[PDB]
Homo-oligomer: A and B are copies of this chain.
Amino acid sequence: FEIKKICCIGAGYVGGPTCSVIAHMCPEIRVTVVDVNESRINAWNSPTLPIYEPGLKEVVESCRGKNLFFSTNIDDAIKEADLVFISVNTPTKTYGMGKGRAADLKYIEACARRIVQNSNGYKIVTEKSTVPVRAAESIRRIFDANTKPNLNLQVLSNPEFLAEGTAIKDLKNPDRVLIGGDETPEGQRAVQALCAVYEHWVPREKILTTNTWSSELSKLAANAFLAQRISSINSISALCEATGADVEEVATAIGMDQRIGNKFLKASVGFGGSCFQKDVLNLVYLCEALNLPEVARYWQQVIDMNDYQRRRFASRIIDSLFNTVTDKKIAILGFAFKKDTGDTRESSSIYISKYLMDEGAHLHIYDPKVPREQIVVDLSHQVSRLVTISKDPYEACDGAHAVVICTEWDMFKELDYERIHKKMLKPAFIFDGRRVLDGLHNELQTIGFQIETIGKKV
């Protein structure tokens, strides 16, 4: 069996770029991306794509209309497809059992029911989005319970490891392509057919085939391990402040051990983004549901440490300002969860800001990329009375008691702090939650700034 027609249900940041790269590297394969938002599909067929990714516009326009297509006729695309990707988002449950930690499979289930209704003959159905472990069994149960004569649907797991901003680079040169299928002979045929698609541009040595459950678990575990590295170095940063050690020196010394590696060992006020906490919490919920409390509380520590790092950093700020910041102007520099993005999901800036707002602080927030409306929404259920969004860092720092750096924007390293210090109220504090002012502490102290930072003793 040769895959010639691919349908991806979901034109988001996973289904879009992934199938765009497939059509780019597989000219013979017809790739149709379908979705429910007519605005999205129209945008995908427009000169301005509904998502910005470097190289995506170059990739899409060189394939769109030839073998890459975007449409709203999901039923027709499903019927003709040989391979159906399921790329709908699985949001965290908002209520009920597993609220806040379990994944809500309602979209995947809705997708599976739609697929089985519009499918005849042999097809391969592949989970692309991050799913909870054993979710493919739910898809197979739906397929089994709604079977038709000569209808043979094979379910595979092919989790995506792309990152925002570098999706195209990650898709064209992946660290590994993970494909999971049943150990049965029919499942292995489906696995090889999907492997043959990736083999057009991915070396065979980087294509790892596993069972379905291992593939689903590996996606969760990878993000949990990464978050754990950050929580671990953050735990050391608290110890460094207590001992006189420096977390950057420790991290450099740790990372030179080749068995540990030097990536993801940067201490910070806390990890953010829409993947790390969500995946760890889903891992914790899975363990609790499987009667593995020891494993659950093990991985809960990654989240607990991340929360502790934020609370501790906020408490240092409050304690430094005499345990009272009511009506005190505090400049928050950086609101994105990391530099060079507008994404604020689970940004440590949100939690630091909320803690200071709980104390009645007047926050003046500057971020070069996060739009003004996003900041208000994230801080909103108070925001009108306590939060001001500044146009430039000097506006936020004027008349402020403290400057809190929550995102590692490169521009913050280049601010005219002598100018900032003149208009700040004294004593003037800088709280570097990202270690971006290292090497400037001597100059800042001579200017007259009390500089406090993560993982360095005061």
Q: Residues of A at under 8 Å CB distance from B?
A: 93, 95-98, 102, 104-106, 109, 133-134, 138, 141-142, 144-146, 161, 175-176, 178, 206, 208, 210-211, 213-218, 221-222, 224-226, 228-229, 231-232, 235-236, 238-240, 242-246, 249-250, 252-254, 256-261, 263-264, 283, 286-287, 290-292, 294-295, 297-299, 301, 304-305, 308, 315, 318, 322-324, 326-327, 358-360, 426-428, 448
Contact = CB atoms under 8 A, between A and B. Distances in A.
B97 A359 contact: yes
Nearest to A246: B214
Contacts of A298: 231-232, 235, 301, 304-305
B295 A211 contact: no
Contact of A246 (B211, B239, B243): B211
Contact of A214 (B240, B260, B263, B295): B240
A322 B138 contact: yes
B250 A221 contact: yes
Contact of A322 (B105, B225, B261, B448): B105
B258 A263 contact: yes
Contacts of A304: 294, 298
B217 A245 contact: yes
Contacts of A299: 235
A244 B157 CA distance: 14
A210 B246 contact: yes
B222 A254 contact: yes
Highest count of chain B CB atoms <10 Å: which of A105, A161, A222: A222
- In the complex, which of the residues A242, A253, A297, A358 has the most CB atoms of chain B within 10 Å of its own CB atom? A253
Given A96-B358, A256-B175, A359-B96, A210 B249 contact: yes
A198 to B, nearest CB: 14
A253 B218 contact: yes
Contacts of A428: 145
Copies in the complex: 3
Given A240-B217, A426-B145, A427-B142, A210 B324 contact: no
Nearest to A265: B225
A239 B415 CA distance: 49
Nearest to A116: B426
A325 to B, nearest CB: 8
Contacts of A215: 249, 253
Contact of A297 (B232, B253, B301, B358): B301
A151 to B, nearest CB: 13
A4 to B, nearest CB: 28
A448 B144 CA distance: 11
A77 to B, nearest CB: 23
A244 B104 contact: no
A76 B222 CA distance: 56
A315 B98 CA distance: 11
A305 B294 CA distance: 7
Contacts of A96: 318, 358-360
A448 B147 CA distance: 12
6 contacts: A106-B324, A109-B322, A134-B244, A145-B426, A175-B256, A239-B290
From A105, A221, A299, A301, name the one whose CB has the most chain B CB atoms within 10 angstroms: A221
A249 B211 CA distance: 8
